[PDB]
Amino acid sequence: SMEILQVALHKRDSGEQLGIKLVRRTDEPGVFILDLLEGGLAAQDGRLSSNDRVLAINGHDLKYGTPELAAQIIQASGERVNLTIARPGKPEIEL
Numbered sequence: 001s002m003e004i005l006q007v008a009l010h011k012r013d014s015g016e017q018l019g020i021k022l023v024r025r026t027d028e029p030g031v032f033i034l035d036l037l038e039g040g041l042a043a044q045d046g047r048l049s050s051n052d053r054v055l056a057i058n059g060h061d062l063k064y065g066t067p068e069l070a071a072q073i074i075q076a077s078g079e080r081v082n083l084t085i086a087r088p089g090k091p092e093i094e095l
Contacts, residue, residue: 003087004055007047011079018042018074018081022054022067030054031062031070049087056084 009018019040023032033052036043054062057073058081074081 001089004085005047005087006082006084007042007045008080008082009041009045011041011077011081014079016041019044020048022070024067029064031065031067048083048085051088053086053088054083055086058082 011018017037017040019037019042021034021037023034024030025032031054033048033050033054035050036048042048054065054070056062057070058077060073062070062073
């Protein structure tokens with residue numbers, strides 16, 4: 001299973017970063033959050049998480065995208081940056 005959710009962050013200046021480390025993976029397609037940067041917009045917002053898959057940013061499809069394409073979109077964005085995320089899997093597993 002997965003959860004699909006939308007997270008809107010707001011840049012306080014046009015050059016503000018989101019505070020997200022984005023990666024590609026060697027065994028599945030997509031752009032993924034590895035982790036968030038301390039004190040960044042994403043961390044302050046709280047919602048985004050390690051292992052989230054970024055499906056789109058500002059309506060721009062990233063399902064089969066790259067970190068580079070995400071970077072291009074974010075750097076050119078206006079103040080509102082909306083990320084559509086897929087969060088796979090269970091939050092707790094007893095094993």
